[PDB]
Design a protein around this ligand. Structure first.
Ligand code: ZN
Length: 55
């Protein structure tokens, strides 16, 4: 997960980032993944679901 910025808000998103990747890959609703990812506060998601530079 990117430092400084908000990509967790308390809970790690890296381990979950795999879910987003797998889902978004096949074509699954990422926002739904966000629910699974477990990223408190949308302040992170809003940046993730859009950017979330997984590369
Ligand atoms: Zn946050």
């Amino acid at each position: 997960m990117i430092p400084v910025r908000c990509l967790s808000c308390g809970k790690p998103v890296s381990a979950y980032f795999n879910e987003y990747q797998r889902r978004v890959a096949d074509g699954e609703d990422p926002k739904d993944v966000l629910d699974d990812l477990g990223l408190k506060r949308y302040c992170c998601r809003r940046m993730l679901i859009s950017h979330v530079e997984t590369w």
